[PDB]
Structure formats: structure tokens, C-alpha cells
Write a protein that binds this ligand. Sequence first.
Ligand SMILES: *[C@@H]1O[C@H](CO[C@@H]2O[C@@H](C)[C@@H](O)[C@@H](O)[C@@H]2O)[C@@H](O[C@@H]2O[C@H](CO)[C@@H](O[C@@H]3O[C@H](CO[C@H]4O[C@H](CO)[C@@H](O)[C@H](O)[C@@H]4O)[C@@H](O)[C@H](O)[C@@H]3O)[C@H](O)[C@H]2NC(C)=O)[C@H](O)[C@H]1NC(C)=O
Ligand SMILES: *[C@@H]1O[C@H](CO)[C@@H](O)[C@H](O)[C@H]1NC(C)=O
Lengths: 231, 216
Amino acid sequence: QVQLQQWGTGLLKPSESLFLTCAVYNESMSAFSWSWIRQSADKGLEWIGEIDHLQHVNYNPSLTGRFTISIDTSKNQFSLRFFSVIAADAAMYYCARGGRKVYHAYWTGYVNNCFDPWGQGTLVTVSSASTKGPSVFPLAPSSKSTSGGTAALGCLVKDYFPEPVTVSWNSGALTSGVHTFPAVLQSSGLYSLSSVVTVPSSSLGTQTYICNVNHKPSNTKVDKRVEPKSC
Amino acid sequence: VHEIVLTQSPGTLSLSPGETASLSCRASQSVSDKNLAWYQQRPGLPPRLLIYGVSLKNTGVPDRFSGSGSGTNFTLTITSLESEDSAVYFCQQYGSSPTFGQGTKVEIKRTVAAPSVFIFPPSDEQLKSGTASVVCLLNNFYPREAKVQWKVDNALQSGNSQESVTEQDSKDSTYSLSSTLTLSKADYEKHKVYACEVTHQGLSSPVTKSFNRGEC
Ligand SMILES: *[C@@H]1O[C@H](CO[C@@H]2O[C@@H](C)[C@@H](O)[C@@H](O)[C@@H]2O)[C@@H](O[C@@H]2O[C@H](CO)[C@@H](O[C@@H]3O[C@H](CO[C@H]4O[C@H](CO)[C@@H](O)[C@H](O)[C@@H]4O)[C@@H](O)[C@H](O)[C@@H]3O)[C@H](O)[C@H]2NC(C)=O)[C@H](O)[C@H]1NC(C)=O
Ligand SMILES: *[C@@H]1O[C@H](CO)[C@@H](O)[C@H](O)[C@H]1NC(C)=O
């Protein structure tokens, strides 16, 4: 199974250089073209550029000159480097396997320049604000009944920057009924999100509920137990 | 070389299971040969290739996904719609330098489901920090339209809260909404009754969840 794994630093100040790398497993670099694609809320999906095993590139004409794509055919990795980012470069950046190589007499071409599979994506934030780890506050259910059959509990992941954070429950053992909401940007410039789960009200006294919060930009990792609130 | 702009219509489509979805993708100029692809995207995931070569399906794509068209007019057809088809669909041309459409969001209709409403008081941990966040949860409702009103000692709150909504669940086709009313600890302790009033067509009347601060 072909797999693309990517990494790189996502948060950077304006006029700073972005550098992302994509490792290709279970595939020869010379059998396909390899592209970088970004996705933002303002511009949607934007193809950035592509490269082949001969180090030949083709760039987005609206972005040419602002970046360069390189390939390491021996290590099965290719990279993207923006020389000096601007605010409009904030987006989710993906790598993908592009067109498939076709053999001709004395040359080779590429057909069907669509993208499959994709990398997991690297979220890029362009800001001069410093990183900040979140506080994890419980969204406690009541010891008395809030709805007789089903209770809701959760965690408030508040005042962090930048995106993203991950939330699981009971180290992944609890997934049913979990809702992790999109974060909101507060007036202070810090993000805040909630993750909730609905559980049987009879389990509140016996079953332990722990939200696993991870904010990798700040290396803030918290396991917060959520207890019923009694009066 | 210049970029061929792809325009998708409609922006949003809402259909019941079993119906047929028809998604349009118009190109500003002719797309050579059959150099168009279709993608399906779900939250937190990269786009998933469905169709390439206008009509050729990707591995694992059911027969109910079919594409057609040529020149500047292309269409993605999804028959026998299912709940998991709730997603955003993009078209992409590769006749010139690759460009994408803006996407069409497909909502899958379901039976009316009233929201289960839960209110959460601020935690003692946060109150020590000098701030108080009150949270209201609307769980698993449909349709998407819903009204959340915060009331603090019967004072209607306007502009003092923020909310976010999950994308439509791929299994039960519901939405959920989280709303956060944040105050300073000083302003929080000036009032007693904190209420969340929810209006939704699945409810026979608006539901209010509330608590009294400092009575515990
Ligand atoms: C890359 O993808 C391969 C699979 O893809 C194949 O291999 C690559 C190299 C290309 O040639 C593709 O075209 C191919 O399709 C993954 O490798 C496979 O990993 C699985 C494990 O997930 C291996 O399966 C194991 O086999 C063990 C031995 O099986 C023997 O015993 C069983 C039982 O008696 C018997 O039935 C069998 O016939 C063998 O005799 C087994 O103990 C274990 O439990 C497991 O089933 C499989 O063999 C691997 N294939 C190859 C060719 O090595 C890579 O994991 C993947 N890499 C990445 C990074 O994604
Ligand atoms: C584009 O195709 C759709 C169906 O495939 C059709 O309904 C529509 O009229 C076409 N538009 C043009 C301009 O050809």
C-alpha cells in the first residue's frame, strides 16, 4: 500500500521561510509525478507545483518565483520551500502522488495528473504571536440527572495558539458519541474549543472519563479526568 | 500559461437518501481530452479521489458515482444517496496547470431530530484563573437551523458568546452545536441565573437549561 507521510514546522512569522518534507513509502519516485497542494479558507484548494525523478518541475504560474520544489530520489522524499511567507500563505499543505508515467519511444510522459494518495496534511500558520499551551477545564455532568437516560460531559480546551489540538477520550477506548467541535478564535487572538461525549447516566458513578488533549506546537499534553459535580 | 477557473454549482445541495445528486463543474475555457477529476472531502482529512479521466472511477468507488461531460461542462452524478455521501465534492482539471473548483457541499436529509440540550457551569479550576466560561451543548439535531439564546438574570445576551457546529455526521446525519458564554470572574459573580434557551423545529416549545451560580 502506497503511503505518503509529511512533516515540517507549521507556525512561522511573516517573511520567514517555510520548509515541508514528504516521505513516499511503497512506491518508486520515477513511476509518478509528485505535487504539493495547499487548502485555505480564502482560496480553497491550490495546486502549488510538481516534480519528477529527473528533477523537472512545473509551478503554479500565480506562485512561480516564491518557492522551489526539490526531490531526493534515493531517499524517496520530496520537499517544498517558500522563501519568505506572507499572511496569505496560511493553509493546510498536502503532498500527493500525481500523474502516472507512460513509456514512449525515446522518452517518457505523464498522464492523468490527478492526486491519489495524499499526505496527512501540515497546517501552516503565519503569525508573529508566540505559541501558548491551552488550559483544559472539565465540562462536568451533574451527579443528579441532566436527562434521565443520557448525560453529557466534556473538556474545554481554552486559550491556545496556534492550531491544531487533538482530543481523544480514554486513550481512544471511547469514541462513540464523541463530538469535538471546530475551534473558535477569541477576541484575544487565542483559540478555544470543546470536546463532548454523551454517555449513559448510570455510568457516571462507575466509569472513569478522561479527555486526552495534545497541543503539539507548545508540547502541552494533558489527561484531564472529568468528574460529576455534586451539591 | 494561465489558470483555468472551475466554477461548481450549486454551492450547497440537500437531498434525501435514495435520491440522485447532480453536481456541476463549469470551466472558463475548454479542458483538453478528458482531463478532469472529482474528489470527496470529509472533515480533518485530505480530499479523496473519486473519478479521474472524466468518467473513470478510482479503486473502491461504487458504481453509483459517475462522471461525464467535455469541453467546459462536466457533471458528477451520485445515485442512491447514502448518509456517508454527506461531504464536500471538488472537481479538478489537468488539461493545463492543475486547478480546483470551489466545491459543492452535499447535505443528506433525514428525519427531524430535536437537540438534546446540556448546560455546563464554569469549573472551579477556571474560576481560580479569574475567568468564567459557560457552555451550552446542542447534541445530534436536524435540520441545521437552530437558535441559541443566552440569558443572564433574564438579560438577553447579544454579541457576548461564540458558537461552532460540527459537520453533518456521516452515520446519523445530525449536527451538534457548542456555544460558549465567557465573562470575567468579577462580572460572573454579579449575577445568579445563567440560562441557555434553545429553539428548534423538533421541539414543541423552546427548551431552557439553567443553573444558579454559587448555590451548590
Ligand atoms: C508496503 O506494502 C506492503 C504490501 O504491498 C506489497 O508489497 C510491496 C513491497 C509491493 O510489492 C506491493 O506491490 C505489494 O502489494 C506491506 O508489506 C506487507 O505487510 C504485511 C503485514 O501487514 C505482510 O503480511 C504478513 O505476512 C507474514 C508472513 O506470512 C506468512 O505466513 C502466513 C500465515 O502462515 C501465510 O499465509 C503467508 O503466505 C506467509 O507464508 C505474517 O506472519 C503476518 O502476520 C502478516 O500477515 C506482507 O507479507 C507484506 N508484504 C510484503 C511483500 O512484504 C508493507 O507493510 C507496506 N509498507 C508501508 C511502509 O506501508
Ligand atoms: C451542462 O450539463 C448539464 C447536465 O450534464 C445540463 O443540464 C446543462 O444544461 C449543461 N450546460 C451547458 C451550458 O451546456
